[PDB]
Each structure stands twice: as C-alpha cells, then as structure tokens.
C-alpha cells in the first residue's frame, strides 16, 4: 500500500506506528505470514478485543476460550507466550479481570519485536522500502 520511505524509517523506530498504519500492518502481516507467526500478533489482538468487552460473565467465557485455545501449553493454537507468565495465567484464569491477559499481551508483543521485528528490519522487504543498498 501507499507508504513513503520517511513513514517506513519511522516504522523502524515506532512499532506501534508500524501496526497502526494500515500500510504497515499490511506489510507486517504478509511478511509474518511466511513464518505463520501471525498467531502471536493476533493472539494479543484478540486479548484487546477481550479487553473491549463489557460483559462480566462474558469476560469469563471469553477468557476460558482464550485459555484452552491459546493460553495452554498444548492448545489447538499453542501460543509462544512465556512459560512462567502462562503458568500464572493458567492459575489466575479462575476469575479473569478485563485486562487479565495484559501480561500475555506485553510478553508476546515484545517477543515479536526481538524476534520477528528484527529480521523484518533487515529483510529484503524493509530494505526494499529503504531502497538503500544490498
């Protein structure tokens, strides 16, 4: 999508700016698809959708869904969330708060950074946005 090199270099400092920019989100998800790591980004995105809820009982229903389907070490998805964190969650899932998975959000978010975002910055994709030199 329409992005200028300036916007691109700004994506190289502000991860949220990359995400919030429709063009950036597009580029990042398409790249992230090659390694199927989109699971992680959409994981805590789903946690924000959970955080968007306002139904107390629904909080438990949603949290239980996210629990068995994502939070678990096995799960049909199996999220790359930190062990110690998901351990505390598997226990704290009895009475989840609106931001119960705020820890999970923080973990996975900065995990994609140090893992996927680094290679993203040195990928031919981002270097193409730079048009500098191979």
- What CATH number is given to the structural domain containing 16? 1.10.196.10
Q: Is residue 1 part of a domain?
A: no
Question: Are residues 101 and 80 both part of a single domain?
Answer: yes
The verdict on 101 and 47 lying in the same domain is yes
CATH code for the domain of 93: 1.10.167.10
CA pair distance 70, 19, nearest whole angstrom: 22
Q: Exposure string (b/e) for 122-133, b if CB count within 10 Å is 16 or more?
A: eeebbeebeeee
In terms of domains, do 59 and 69 share one? yes
Number of folded domains that form the chain: 2
Do 104 and 44 reside in the same domain of the chain?
yes
Encoded tokens for 72: 């678990």
4: its two tokens: 């200028």
Does one domain contain both 79 and 27?
no
Residues 86 and 106 placed together within one structural domain of the fold: yes
Solved using: NMR
- Domain span at 61: 36-115
Residue 13: other Cβ atoms inside 10 A: 8
Best CA proximity match to 63, nearest among 24, 28, 98: 98
């Amino acid at each position: 999508s329409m992005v200028s090199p300036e916007e691109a270099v700004k994506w190289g400092e502000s991860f949220d700016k990359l995400l919030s920019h429709r063009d950036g989100l597009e580029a990042f998800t398409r790249f992230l698809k090659t390694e199927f790591s989109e699971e992680n980004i959409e994981f805590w995105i789903a946690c924000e959708d959970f955080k968007k809820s306002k139904g107390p009982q629904q909080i438990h229903l949603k949290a239980k869904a996210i629990y068995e389907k994502f939070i678990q070490t096995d799960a049909p998805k199996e999220v790359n969330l930190d062990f110690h964190t998901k351990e505390v969650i598997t226990n704290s899932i009895t009475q989840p708060t609106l931001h119960s998975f705020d820890a999970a959000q923080s973990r996975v978010y900065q995990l994609m950074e140090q893992d996927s975002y680094t290679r993203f910055l040195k990928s031919d994709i981002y270097l193409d946005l730079m048009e500098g030199r191979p």
